[PDB]
From a paper:
Our recent discovery revealed that JMJD5 and JMJD7 specifically make first cleavage at methylarginine sites on histone tails through endopeptidase activities and continue to trim histone tails with aminopeptidase activities to generate “tailless nucleosomes”, which should be overcome by Pol II without further additional assistance, just as that of Archaea bacteria. During our pursuit in the characterization of potential histone arginine demethylases, we found that the catalytic cores of both JMJD5 and JMJD7 specifically cleave arginine methylated histone tails through both endopeptidase and exopeptidase activities. To address these questions, we have determined a series of structures of c-JMJD5, JMJD7, and c-JMJD5 with substrates, coupled with biochemical data. Comparison of c-JMJD5 and JMJD7 structures to those of metalloproteases revealed that both c-JMJD5 and JMJD7 contain basic elements required for hydrolysis, such as similar residues chelating divalent ions (His321, Asp323, and His400 in JMJD5) and rich negatively charged sidechains as proton acceptor (Asp323 and imidic-Gln275 in JMJD5) within the catalytic center of JMJD5.
To investigate the basis of specific recognition and catalysis, we determined the complex structure of c-JMJD5 in the presence of a symmetric dimethyl arginine residue derivative (DM(s)-Arg), Zn2+, and α-KG. Zn2+ substitutes functionally for Fe2+ (see below) and is more stable than Fe2+ in solution. We found that the methyl groups of di-methyl arginine are buried in a negatively charged pocket consisting of one glutamic acid (Glu238), two tyrosines (Tyr243, Tyr272), two tryptophans (Trp248, Trp310), one Ser318, and a portion of α-KG. This configuration is similar to the structure of Tudor domains bound by methylarginine residues. The carboxyl group is coordinated with Zn2+; this structure could mimic the final step of peptidase cleavage with the oxygen of the carbonyl interacting with Zn2+. Interestingly, as pointed out by one of our reviewers, the sidechain of Ser318 makes a hydrogen bond with NE atom of sidechain of methylarginine, the binding should also contribute to the high binding affinity. Based on the complex structure, much higher binding affinity between c-JMJD5 and pH3R2me2a (~0.1 μM) versus Tudor domains and methylarginine containing peptides (~4 μM) can be explained by the presence of additional charge-charge interactions within the methylarginine binding pocket of c-JMJD5 contributed by α-KG and a sidechain of glutamic acid (Glu238). From the complex structure of c-JMJD5 and the methylated arginine derivative, it is clear that α-KG is not only involved in pocket formation, but also forms a salt bridge or hydrogen bond with the methylated guanidine group. α-KG also participates in the chelation of Zn2+ ions. First, the sidechain of methylated arginine docks at the negatively charged pocket with aromatic cage, bringing the carbonyl group of this residue within close proximity to Zn2+.
Numbering used by the authors: 181 to 416
Write the structure that this text describes.
């Protein structure tokens, strides 16, 4: 496929018309790049503000066979165990609303203006922290709302497949896992999943300051390339 387009602070109507309404992915630059989080958030500072709080942590590379488990620990324990000291397994602080838990971290972000183009209420926008070492993998999956994924620390390799291509992505049959792909994007078994080979996609390397707009129900797979902190806004 091709690289995801990058636009420097598009006007709202131009984002509405070329991207939101047709549902095409884009990176928005010059938008979140000066938010306080971009210069303020570090291991020192995350420990200082959030260190003693309780967070859920996903342990294991990815979630299919339950090797993957979910646990709870303090942010300090997560940093020390899964990031700093030669971790024994991949832990990921994933899909957690950490800014409703620590309001003082919410002062470091904002809700992007483009969300007001939606039909939903600003109070109901779901804000999720994603924080973990180099190498976390979110398997190919789709989400029920629009998403702004704001990169803060580190880089993420991302791949996007359209809803129109779902027939080549082999979703799990169980309605629980309905929206997750059985395919390992970066090493697909093409004996089992042959149609995955021909399906087109976009990909990118998302970097700090940059916002990736993921259209509703667009499939995405995400691998952190460095120690990484992203913040997702689910809106509608
Ligand atoms: C690696 N782990 C992850 N989540 C637990 N990755 C991305 C979130 C996928 C989830 N189905 C969603 O609703 O976005
Ligand atoms: O693991 C990641 O960073 C991707 C998060 C994600 O899937 C989402 O923003 O909905
Ligand atoms: Zn997602």
């Amino acid at each position: 496929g091709s690289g995801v387009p990058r636009l420097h602070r598009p006007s709202l109507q131009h984002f509405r018309e070329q991207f939101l309404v047709p549902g095409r992915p884009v990176i928005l630059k010059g938008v979140a790049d000066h938010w306080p989080c971009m210069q303020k958030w570090s291991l020192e500072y995350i420990q200082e503000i959030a260190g003693c709080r309780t967070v859920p942590v996903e342990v294991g590379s990815r979630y299919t066979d339950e090797e993957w488990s979910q646990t709870l620990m303090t942010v300090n324990e997560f940093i020390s165990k899964y990031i700093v000291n030669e971790p024994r397994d991949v832990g990921y602080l994933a899909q957690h609303q950490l800014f409703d838990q620590i309001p003082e971290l919410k002062q470091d972000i904002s809700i992007p203006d483009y969300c007001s183009l939606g039909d939903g209420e600003e109070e109901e926008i779901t804000i999720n922290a994603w924080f973990g070492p180099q190498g976390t993998i979110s398997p190919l999956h789709q989400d029920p709302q629009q998403n702004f994924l704001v990169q803060v620390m580190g880089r993420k390799y991302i791949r996007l497949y359209s809803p129109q291509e779902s027939g080549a992505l082999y979703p799990h049959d169980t309605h629980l896992l309905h929206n997750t792909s059985q395919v390992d994007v970066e090493n697909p078994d093409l004996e089992k999943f042959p149609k995955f080979a021909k399906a087109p996609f976009l990909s990118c390397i998302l970097s700090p300051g940059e916002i990736l707009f993921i259209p509703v129900k667009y499939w995405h797979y995400v691998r952190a390339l460095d120690l990484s902190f992203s913040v997702s806004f689910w809106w509608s």
